[model samples]
Target: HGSVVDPASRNYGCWERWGDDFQNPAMADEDPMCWQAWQDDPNAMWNWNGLYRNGSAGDFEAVVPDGQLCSGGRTESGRYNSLDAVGPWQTTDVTDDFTVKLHDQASHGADYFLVYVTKQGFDPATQALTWGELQQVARTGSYGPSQNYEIPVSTSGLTGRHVVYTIWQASHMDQTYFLCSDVDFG
Candidate 1:
């Protein structure tokens, strides 16, 4: 993932400079500069102009080229990056049980993956990561060619849809890609 906002942007540059580093290093410790900059300027714009842009914030979204199968919905101007993919959704049921399997190619190195289940509807205007309700499930460390993860969602008193999963590349020099083949619901 990359940012479109110029590196010269006041405080946004900090994320542009160090965001990728954080993904590569996957260090538990926070980067002082990034933390300080975020505290100083929280509204700084971040552009994820790759393959998907949901058009919620400043034209930042996800974009997958033709022929590439990105099953999940895409978003731009999100809280973290410019663009993000939603999930390889099979159905849209809030109060149902479902399973999503992520298949990674053998050549791809493994890294940390963050899975979030949110209650509120995702808005691009604010580009905020806050959810009315949320749960963080798996955080994969370092591994081999492929990894499988499972998550459960409870849609109660929530009108919005469920965002099943979000994948983040979290290792050095490793290209992490996922193929979500199936989502079983009962």
Candidate 2:
């Protein structure tokens, strides 16, 4: 599947297949934000992130600007800019603590990972996720070229909807993959 890679779409990233089958009408009332992402660019949730950046992968705040974190810093017309939308998202509820897993379909090697969870009172229904509202929960150093990671993340003292923002840095190249997975705790 060889497609043209434009400069505007270059070096962009996203959570793997977060926009799959998003055309259903129910999505508008259920996960409106993800539906908008489908309306914008189905490829953003599909491709752009097939590769990695060679520089500035370690400095997320430097490369990916504030409010544009979910978009992987891609903010041009006809791009995945709609993912920057702040609103309700698709989520899964967990009544107890759970482990977060990262699969390596891209075979992008792991360097290090930083996992963060939203604060107790942060509201994903009304507000967007920002770095200021997140608390770092786990950080791990890695080795070798890509595979998968089974990370045990904690949900202690947190009993509400939360977004788990994971930063998976690649060791093969200087690329950092971010996953803004939404979750709910009861």
Candidate 3:
């Protein structure tokens, strides 16, 4: 089990930011999105790395439907369902060129990784993320078992807030991880 660590994925970022102070009342105003997530299921952030699904068979769209991409189609008994909530979640700042670094906690080597970015003009804050709204930004070949894997990407004419979706196909089996990282191309 693993997740995108840099430009932190939804649950990972929520866990990183609020895990220590999750019970605080300030979250409602300071980070309403995460507040809702914590309300829905703290396990989503508690077990952030357990977001992946088994035996996807490379058919992501078949299992992960539109508007449910951020929750990996509500995997793990819907533990991460709150991630699909349409709201103003916090974002990581980035340049046109950036590196997506994933931490392979179990050292599961990647058969491949597919990275997608929301198209320009797609308002993630109000609109739900769909397959059609995304543009594949990077696809990489196999990588051996390691703790961290980074994919370099460069985009032209993309700005504002966007979702960076990463699909990690574990080499050991048909397991796949669907990760969504919110970013601002400043």
Candidate 4:
């Protein structure tokens, strides 16, 4: 379940003409039909719906670059920031598990690969929601291109519709930035 849409406008039709690798120069120009479609039906565009938004309460302002990765489309860096809240998902008695697999360039200082399970959504304080807590499930080992980690949680009384996982690059650190390849949960 992955897609690439035009950052300028939220229309899947634009992607039909632009192709998946819209950033590349070969598909750089906007399609006339796509623009016309957007003009005719403004509601056809997809909107940004993530766990967090820039300048939202309890969110940290992140200096992201334009075209950064997102669930759907990419944007010029400033429009998005790291997810700072958690929880609000209804938990079941079944075993719930999550894994975060990513690649890093290596930098000086501490960068964390985190897996959090909570009953409440992300809260700025304690970084957990009601009846929920964060577990420092994994940390990067020093050396090499990067590493991977798996975190598992037992479902319990948690109730809500949202669950969040995030990566944090500490403010002051010396290390190569990382790329997250895939995050999967079941």
All candidates' lDDT scores?
A: 0.33, 0.60, 0.94, 0.29
Candidate 1 or 3, higher lDDT? 3
My TM-score estimates for the predictions, one after another, are: 0.33, 0.78, 0.98, 0.31
lDDT of residue 43 for candidate 1: 38
| lDDT (C-alpha) at residue 126 in model 4 | 33
Off by over 4 Å in 2: 1-22, 48-54, 75-78
Shift in Å, residue 97, candidate 3: 0.6
Candidate 3 lDDT tens digits, 43-153: 999998998889889999999999999999988889899999998989999999999999977898999999999999999999999999999999999999998999998
Candidate 4 — which residues are off by over 4 angstroms? 1-77, 81-95, 103-110, 121-144, 147-155, 170-186
User: Candidate 3: misplaced stretches above 4 Å?
Assistant: none
* Candidate 1 lDDT, 1-186, residue by residue in tens: 321121122123344555556343432244443443344333332322232222212111233332122222322233332122232222233334334333332224335554454434543123323323344545556544444333333333434333334444524453333221111222
TM-score result, candidate 3: 0.98
RMSD of each: 17.0, 6.3, 0.7, 12.2
Best of the candidates, TM-score? 3
Per-model clash counts, in order, read: 15, 1, 0, 24
Q: Pick the candidate with the highest lDDT.
A: 3
Error of 3 at 84 (Å): 0.4
Model 2, 153: alpha-carbon shift in Å?
1.1
